[PDB]
Amino acid sequence: MGCTYTIQPGDTFWAIAQRRGTTVDVIQSLNPGVNPARLQVGQVINVPC
User: Which domains are present in the chain?
Assistant: First the structure.
């Protein structure tokens, strides 16, 4: 019963985490497949609903 989030140009891990109400520790703990050192445009990831 979770939720997802679409990563578009201008959005980042920490950034998206802010509004989402989460932190990098979580974003990276959920979607470790993508590191903050380099993100791809238009990438759908999981977030705390």
Answer: 1-49 (3.10.350.10)
Bridge partners of 3? Answer: 47
Sequence letter at residue 23: T
Give the rounded distance of the alpha carbon of 47 from its chain centre.
Answer: 6
Query: How far apart, in whole angstroms, are the C-alpha atoms of residue 26 and residue 31?
Result: 8
DSSP 1-49: --EEEEE-TT--HHHHHHHHT--HHHHHHH-TTS-TTS--SSEEEEE--
What backbone torsions phi and psi does residue 33 show, to the nearest 5 degrees?
Answer: -65, -20
- Technique used by the depositors: NMR
